Amino acid sequence: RADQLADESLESTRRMLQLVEESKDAGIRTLVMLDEQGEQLERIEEGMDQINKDMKEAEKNLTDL
Amino acid sequence: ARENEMDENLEQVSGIIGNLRHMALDMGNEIDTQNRQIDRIMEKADSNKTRIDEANQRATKM
Amino acid sequence: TSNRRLQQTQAQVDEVVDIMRVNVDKVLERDQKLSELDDRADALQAGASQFETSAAKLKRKYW
Amino acid sequence: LSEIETRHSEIIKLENSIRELHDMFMDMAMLVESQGEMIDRIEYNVEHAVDYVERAVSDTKK
Amino acid sequence: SGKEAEAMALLAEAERKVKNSQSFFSGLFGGSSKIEEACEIYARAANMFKMAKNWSAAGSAFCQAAQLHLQLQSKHDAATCFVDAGNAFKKADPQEAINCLMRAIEIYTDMGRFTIAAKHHISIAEIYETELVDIEKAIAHYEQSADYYKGEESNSSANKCLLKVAGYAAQLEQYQKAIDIYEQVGTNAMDSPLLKYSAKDYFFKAALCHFCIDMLNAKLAVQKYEELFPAFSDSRECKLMKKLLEAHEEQNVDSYTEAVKEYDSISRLDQWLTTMLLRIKKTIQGDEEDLR
Amino acid sequence: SGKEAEAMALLAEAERKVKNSQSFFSGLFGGSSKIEEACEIYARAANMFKMAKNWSAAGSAFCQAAQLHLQLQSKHDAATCFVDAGNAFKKADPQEAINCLMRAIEIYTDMGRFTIAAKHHISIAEIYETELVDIEKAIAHYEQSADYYKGEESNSSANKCLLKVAGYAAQLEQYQKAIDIYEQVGTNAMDSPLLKYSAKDYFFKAALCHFCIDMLNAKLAVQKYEELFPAFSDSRECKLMKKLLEAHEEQNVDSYTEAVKEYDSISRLDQWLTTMLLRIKKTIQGDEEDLR
Amino acid sequence: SGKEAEAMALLAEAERKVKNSQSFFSGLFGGSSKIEEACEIYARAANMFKMAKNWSAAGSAFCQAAQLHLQLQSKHDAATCFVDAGNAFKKADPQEAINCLMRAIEIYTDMGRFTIAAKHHISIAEIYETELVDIEKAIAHYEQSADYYKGEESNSSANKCLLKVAGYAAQLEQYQKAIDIYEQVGTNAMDSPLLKYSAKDYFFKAALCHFCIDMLNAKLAVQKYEELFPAFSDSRECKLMKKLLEAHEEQNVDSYTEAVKEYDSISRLDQWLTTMLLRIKKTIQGDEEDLR
Amino acid sequence: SGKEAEAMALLAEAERKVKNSQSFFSGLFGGSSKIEEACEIYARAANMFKMAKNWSAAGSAFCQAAQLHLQLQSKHDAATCFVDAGNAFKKADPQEAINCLMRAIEIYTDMGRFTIAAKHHISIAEIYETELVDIEKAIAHYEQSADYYKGEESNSSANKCLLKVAGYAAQLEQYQKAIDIYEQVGTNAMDSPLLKYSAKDYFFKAALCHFCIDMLNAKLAVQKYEELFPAFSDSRECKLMKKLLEAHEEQNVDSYTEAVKEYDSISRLDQWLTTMLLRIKKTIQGDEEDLR
């Protein structure tokens, strides 16, 4: 039982890091993926502006219409 | 060699969690910047719809 | 190396869950913020595609 | 006996803790990519409507 | 709410747009429209009910406003306010919610956007899960919606739809359908760096779907076929749960609850996975009465 | 700042838009407007103060510019610069901040967008928490804002609003209100794969709200009702903290600090949870003086 | 599907736009166009096939509709429906998919947007990886696409493209090319707080690329150069795997599988990293036959 | 690159827009403009260099195109192509990069958007950190940019700017400035549920900034002031590192490296934190030579 507990603890502590080295690569995957969405979110902010300003002048030119 | 590797794993496990919190802490911050960053896009894409919707009838009746 | 240095990690993983107990809330809200921004920024196209089209229809008596 | 039966039955509480932690990242790393395609279908969708107004802004001032 | 039901819905929101000059007139103008004036004054009219939280009378004014652009034959300008009734009637009569959203779909079909349509095919299916509980109707909405996501290349977001059509089909005894979805998800999950550690969750559901009345005897033929590609899904103990469950399937049926006692402790199972094991636990007692 | 207060606010930003030709003229033109010219030259005028960091004089020029579009009766074009005064007066007189944002809301109400309105109902409530400390006024703004999010289907982002209206109502002795919010959050939290492991945090606050003067004796009736649905929230020791606290409620009142000594060490409690236990710790000494 | 192939593709979608009045006429009008009428009726025509899931006949109608705006010389209005054929022919003949997307690129080139172009240079490369398996053609598409991302400042999203052009070049024996990409990624990864703990994954691939036939003897000269900047990448055991592999490179070649037995257990290696070690394992047996 | 430098930059991109009919003509037209024609043909001209990767000749054509709209006095159309030169000259002469971006700022100042301006005040500061290494000039750009973010309510994204202006000021011996930023960040960090566990990382830098030549003797007065609000930042051992460092400051100076030997192992310190301890390690040897 005592020796067995130690043995049990071996396959405990083996899968313990194998659960938590495993938590690390998903932790680093989100950080690559979240920062990659930042420049996805950057293009929309810049785009929305030009998405608004160039578009915006046309509203000023409505008096011609 | 048995209680050694229990330490030698929980030495290197605590060498992960001191990094694993670290990397999860920026993830708790990187989203917060983006939540503000979508929020600038949010009301502006709400305005840009409303401006054009004013301008559609100003190009429909025109 | 013993019970005490385990209870460093035992309290430390308790912080990581908490920290992430905040983090699942922030990553959820932006989900529904974009999924509604889908309908805004695609009605923006059909608002703008209908617009020009009516300004392709407004080019009369140009000569 | 009792010097590790007290200890190892508390180690199982640590692995029961990380199993709660592990399923939360994989749901999160699912959910970011599950959002990572909604952020694509905005991106080129904006790149559509930029040009429809860019085609509009040259024509409207005429 | 908000100064007496927002002026008692603005005193029926400017006398229910009446005195619209018949809402039809061909004497003076032949090339003008007061119908376009009737758009905003009657779309604002629907908006005042949501301040007064009268959702039942809200969407009733959206639909005729949506009929108004359909009367003016502007397509997209009608569609975005059908959904404003469909968003309105969710906290109201849901049968009026689902068909108004259904009327909103066919405008988006021939518009050029299926993403918006697939978003509402799961929105109509949200109503079938919560209020008007009719599961097999929701199956055809999810199965239709996943066809749109696959048509628009979003293979990641297709699965979040396509899991639930396999999820609800499991307790509806449509296994051989649903056993292919979990297979085609998991085969298309192991090949990516994303979803790779999520993939072992699917095959455990997939092998669980091999328990119709059949192939629990050929569970070995299941798991050797599950051995085949993903290297035992790097041999997670979730599949080792099934491995001891194989020899369990013959004798010692009391160890079934013992097998999950060492699994529900380490991972709290949900109400889906509880019932699927419990329906196996009913069928495994047929082996108990055979032993007598 | 930036070349002498940005040219001393551009020398009062082009002589305060005076010589606008009376800003009203009906002799030459009957179908034109110099008011539209007065928009940009006076919206740029407000912008120059933010370069000089004179926020008090900034929003004073936004509001008349916001009045200018209201004078031109263009609705949306006024609303987006009321908020530019409301963003301006936050680092200024906050009573002028809140009502200008309040004037910005009613334009967005009958516009068709409550998302923008609910964003500012919590922005006005941000001012009530920080500078003009009036908590129960902020309660009605959060409670109004959550009604908009539920009206626009965002059940996830409604809660982040709806927690704080239950959060501040707790120390304002409005428990039986707030005890329903934590219940309706947590009942609507256990049903989802998201928020499931967050749900145990809510019911611990919910059971904590059962300590008005009453139902600490019926704490057993609380926790058996909390046993009922979520399987003890898979039996977190945070609820086991309450379980030993039940038998604590009769005798041995010194063990209250001992019960949190083994809990604040494992999880550093915040200033909200500190006071809620401490107000129980006051009431539990009423059981101490009863024992005498 | 959907009422008999959507009315058998709407009975060939209104008689294949025939009776377009020759689709060319200069008698009555010299300043009008029925071609603009032929746009929507023939773009809707392509849309009806996707309801009937006839993707092969779908994009055949997009391309002439894309030719139609090219006939009307409106540039952008043609480009967004070439890609609707390019999205169509992916579940069809892929050689027709890639060149129609290739024809869509040159409109976006002289338009002012390379982001859209770089998105399709990896979309065309997605087809080269899955269906028309031609790896070195996909290399030139990724290498071209990363030039667009670097031209548009997105240094983060350039790498996700630029890894795969280094990834596929590794098994194509183009190491000295690919050994510079992993170096220039990792040198530009250590300098940022984001991607710092990811950077050790790259240099392990980079040192792995020093195994052409050469510089496994100068592996010490590799790793001392890898010592140089990033402080052993804070000395991860993934580099310590290479450190024991250095003295392994001379003798005891059976310990190669032993060295990864203690590494595949702690971290399940993928099929890329498996083959790269296995091709070293072939070359290390040349040291075994030298020992004889 | 791309068919011989993109037709050798399109054979100087259509003869350098010459034969523009003098680019000025008042004979025929008095109310027309060929300058507007000269916009796109010369903005496309700058675009062809980025295909040929000639960034030095690229932005030289953007700036006159940006001068073009300034010649046409059109707001919002010159500014977005100054930055296209500013993005161009980053892989070129950086002194031409920074001032063209600087010329782009003043258009965005009186436009109504400081978010765009604060994004480029850190973009110009990115150049000062990497190529034209002049740190104290970058200090005034970050300090100006954080004033814009605080003016536009983004208190979260202000800090990511405002840390670096405190970060670079630390090694520039501007502590008493930078000691207030880390204090005002951390005081405004403990009050939020976000950034709360990040806040202990700031005060450790803040107490580290109390080592000018002074207040290492009053380090106790530092840390008791750091005791005061955030409850020892729930007593992280990172502050306990400073606690044993207090009694270290008198004697046993060899234990300084011993104190970080038990800290660099548990947490790999960066090159910022290395030098700040090392400059203390120089000053602590002044206590060693006092002991002699």
UniProtKB/Swiss-Prot annotation, chain B:
Localization: Cytoplasm, Perinuclear region; Cell membrane; Synapse, Synaptosome; Photoreceptor inner segment
Positions of modified residues (Phosphoserine): 14, 47
Site, as annotated: (Microbial infection) Cleavage: 40-41, 57-58
t-SNARE coiled-coil homology domain location: 1-62
Post-translational modification: Palmitoylated. (Microbial infection) Targeted and hydrolyzed by C.botulinum neurotoxin type A (BoNT/A, botA) which hydrolyzes the 197-Gln-|-Arg-198 bond and inhibits neurotransmitter release.
Family membership: Belongs to the SNAP-25 family.
Assembly behavior: Part of the SNARE core complex containing SNAP25, VAMP2 and STX1A;this complex constitutes the basic catalytic machinery of the complex neurotransmitter release apparatus. Recruited to the SNARE complex following binding of the SNARE complex component STX1A to STXBP1. This complex binds CPLX1. Found in a complex containing SYT1, SV2B and syntaxin-1. Found in a ternary complex with STX1A and VAMP8. Interacts with HSC70 and with SYT9, forming a complex with DNAJC5. The interaction with SYT9 is inhibited in presence of calcium. Isoform 1 and isoform 2 interact with BLOC1S6. Interacts with CENPF.
Described function: t-SNARE involved in the molecular regulation of neurotransmitter release. May play an important role in the synaptic function of specific neuronal systems. Associates with proteins involved in vesicle docking and membrane fusion. Regulates plasma membrane recycling through its interaction with CENPF. Modulates the gating characteristics of the delayed rectifier voltage-dependent potassium channel KCNB1 in pancreatic beta cells.
Name the record gives this protein: Synaptosomal-associated protein 25
Organism encoding this protein: Rattus norvegicus
Part of the full-length chain shown: 141 to 202 of 206
Curated annotation (Swiss-Prot), chain C:
Membrane topology of this protein: Single-pass type IV membrane protein
Alphabetical keyword list: Acetylation, Cell membrane, Coiled coil, Cytoplasmic vesicle, Membrane, Phosphoprotein, Synapse, Transmembrane, Transmembrane helix
Entry GO MF terms: calcium-dependent protein binding; calmodulin binding; identical protein binding; lipid binding; molecular adaptor activity; myosin binding; phospholipid binding; protein-containing complex binding
Listed GO CC annotations: clathrin-coated vesicle; cytoplasm; cytoplasmic vesicle; cytoplasmic vesicle membrane; glutamatergic synapse; membrane; neuron projection terminus; perinuclear region of cytoplasm
PTMs per UniProt: Phosphorylated by PRKCZ in vitro and this phosphorylation is increased in the presence of WDFY2. (Microbial infection) Targeted and hydrolyzed by C.botulinum neurotoxin type B (BoNT/B, botB) which hydrolyzes the 76-Gln-|-Phe-77 bond and inhibits neurotransmitter release.
UniProt main location, coarse: membrane
GO BP of this protein: calcium-ion regulated exocytosis; cellular response to insulin stimulus; eosinophil degranulation; establishment of localization in cell; exocytic insertion of neurotransmitter receptor to postsynaptic membrane; Golgi to plasma membrane protein transport; hormone secretion; long-term synaptic potentiation
Cytoplasmic side: 1-63
v-SNARE coiled-coil homology domain: residues covered: 5-63
Origin superkingdom: Eukaryota
Subcellular location: Cytoplasmic vesicle, Secretory vesicle, Synaptic vesicle membrane; Cell membrane
Keyword Membrane set for record: yes
Residue(s) at site: (Microbial infection) Cleavage: 32-34, 40-41, 50-51, 55-56
Tissue expr: Nervous system specific. A higher level expression is seen in the brain as compared to the spinal cord. Expressed in hippocampal neurons.
Recorded family membership: Belongs to the synaptobrevin family.
Official protein name in the record: Vesicle-associated membrane protein 2
Taxonomic source organism: Rattus norvegicus (Rat)
Lineage: Eukaryota, Metazoa, Chordata, Craniata, Vertebrata
Gene this protein is translated from: Vamp2
Entire protein: shown range: 27 to 89 of 116
Curated annotation (Swiss-Prot), chain D:
Superkingdom of the organism of origin: Eukaryota
Tissue-specific expression: Expressed predominantly in cerebral cortex, hippocampus, cerebellum, adrenal medulla and retina with weak expression detected in non-neuronal tissues.
Subcellular localization: Cytoplasmic vesicle, Secretory vesicle, Synaptic vesicle membrane; Cell membrane; Synapse, Synaptosome
Location in chain, cross-link Glycyl lysine isopeptide (Lys-Gly) (interchain with G-Cter in SUMO): 61-62
PTM per Swiss-Prot/TrEMBL: Phosphorylated by CK2.
t-SNARE coiled-coil homology domain span: 1-62
UniProt subunit comment: Part of the SNARE core complex containing SNAP25, VAMP2 and STX1A; this complex constitutes the basic catalytic machinery of the complex neurotransmitter release apparatus. The SNARE complex interacts with CPLX1. Interacts with STXBP1. The interaction with STXBP1 promotes assembly of the SNARE complex. Interacts (via C-terminus) with KCNB1 (via C-terminus); the interaction increases in a calcium-dependent manner and induces a pore-independent enhancement of exocytosis in neuroendocrine cells, chromaffin cells, pancreatic beta cells and from the soma of dorsal root ganglia (DRG) neurons.
Protein task: Plays an essential role in hormone and neurotransmitter calcium-dependent exocytosis and endocytosis. Part of the SNARE (Soluble NSF Attachment Receptor) complex composed of SNAP25, STX1A and VAMP2 which mediates the fusion of synaptic vesicles with the presynaptic plasma membrane. STX1A and SNAP25 are localized on the plasma membrane while VAMP2 resides in synaptic vesicles. The pairing of the three SNAREs from the N-terminal SNARE motifs to the C-terminal anchors leads to the formation of the SNARE complex, which brings membranes into close proximity and results in final fusion.
Family from the record: Belongs to the syntaxin family.
The protein's name: Syntaxin-1A
Biological source species: Rattus norvegicus
Full-protein interval shown: 192 to 253 of 288
